[PDB]
Amino acid sequence: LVMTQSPSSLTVTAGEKVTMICKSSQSLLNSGDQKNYLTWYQQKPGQPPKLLIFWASTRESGVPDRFTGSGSGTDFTLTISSVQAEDLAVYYCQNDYSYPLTFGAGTKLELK
């Protein structure tokens, strides 16, 4: 099971909106409980990854409203409505549906 992220990297100015994509080869929708088992991690440099979103759209405790996960099935997006200096990171999507728990190659956010 393959997770494809795009873009690999991108450069914004703080203030601007940004979108990154995560496709999976196979659907992450479990009709068991009707949730997409897709997780987003923010990893800043010199730092461990940090949970942002789980079940495609549900935002972890503490994470600002400017991060919005969407999509279902095989096609997901993460959107930062207004990028802040503190958002400089690599963003990874992880398959939390079946073993092995594969990650995307990540989208690296850089700033001007």
Partner 1 sequence: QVQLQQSDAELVKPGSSVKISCKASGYTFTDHAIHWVKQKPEQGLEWIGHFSPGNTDIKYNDKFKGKATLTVDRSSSTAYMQLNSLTSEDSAVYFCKTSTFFFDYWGQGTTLTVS
Question: Rule CB under 6 A: which residues touch ligand NO8?
Answer: 97-99
Q: Which does 45 bind (CB under 5 to 8 A by kind): partner 1, ligand NO8, none?
A: none
Beta-strand runs (E) in 56-97: 58-59, 67-72, 75-80, 89-95
Q: Which does 90 bind (CB under 5 to 8 A by kind): partner 1, ligand NO8, none?
A: partner 1
User: Is the backbone of residue 4 left (phi > 0), alpha (psi -120 to 50) or beta?
Assistant: beta
Tell me the C-alpha distance between 1 and 16, whole Å. Answer: 33
In this structure, which amino acid lies at residue 111?
L
Tell me the C-alpha distance between 110 and 56, whole Å. Answer: 24
Q: Which does 40 bind (CB under 5 to 8 A by kind): partner 1, ligand NO8, none?
A: none
DSSP output for 3-21? EEEE-SEEEE-TTS-EEEE
Cβ of residue 105: shortest distance to ligand NO8, in angstroms?
21
Cβ of residue 33: shortest distance to partner 1, in angstroms?
14
Considering the rule CB under 8 A, would residue 51 count as an interface residue with partner 1? yes
Cβ of residue 97: shortest distance to ligand NO8, in angstroms?
6
- Interacting residues with partner 1 (CB under 8 A): 8-9, 39, 41, 43, 48-51, 54, 60, 90, 92, 94, 96, 99-103, 105-106, 108
